[PDB]
Amino acid sequence: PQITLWQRPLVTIKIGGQLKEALLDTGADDTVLEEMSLPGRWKPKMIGGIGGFIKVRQYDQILIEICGHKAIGTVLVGPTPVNIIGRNLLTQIGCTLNF
Amino acid sequence: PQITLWQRPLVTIKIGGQLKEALLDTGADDTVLEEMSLPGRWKPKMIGGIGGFIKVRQYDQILIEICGHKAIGTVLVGPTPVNIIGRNLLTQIGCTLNF
């Protein structure tokens, strides 16, 4: 599809068998998810921006379905108010910027 | 143009007679640039960031040329990890996400 920027580019995603809202974010290197449980081990990480840094847990090889497209890769889980789909998964689903 | 996301979508911008590199950030509501002087009136503004709000300077109706596309709008100047072009100006140059 083609997603407008008049509003935040929020789309529905599915992870596990859970459906959520997430932001398609070209400014984010990584995908950041709101606090949730995932199985397996993780690595500690710190990620920052305007304002500073939050502590997150890095899981690898996580499936996120985005508008029917299955992306598999690293996700960072922590105290974000919004699920953020970053370039590591946007590339997989063939997402481009166009103007 | 069409911009893929395997790398950061950093582009050259011309603002206030100066050439800069900035990140095209669909996740950003607003455009935020590193410390620089710009002509005209500005007001202090607080913006929501990681773990809290940050003080920026707000300059309205500023011309900026992105990839050869002209935008005229609000630019915030303050402590950002990188120059980011947010939806306020991305909408003006016709930017959408596609997959």
Ligand SMILES: CC(C)CN(C[C@H]1CNC[C@@H]1COCc1ccccc1)S(=O)(=O)c1ccccc1
């Ligand atoms: C929450 C906000 C202050 C973070 N920044 C913008 C958001 C919007 N797209 C990238 C970043 C989200 O993903 C980054 C992120 C980092 C830590 C916690 C959540 C999200 S930013 O301007 O600081 C920034 C822009 C570009 C790259 C990195 C940061």
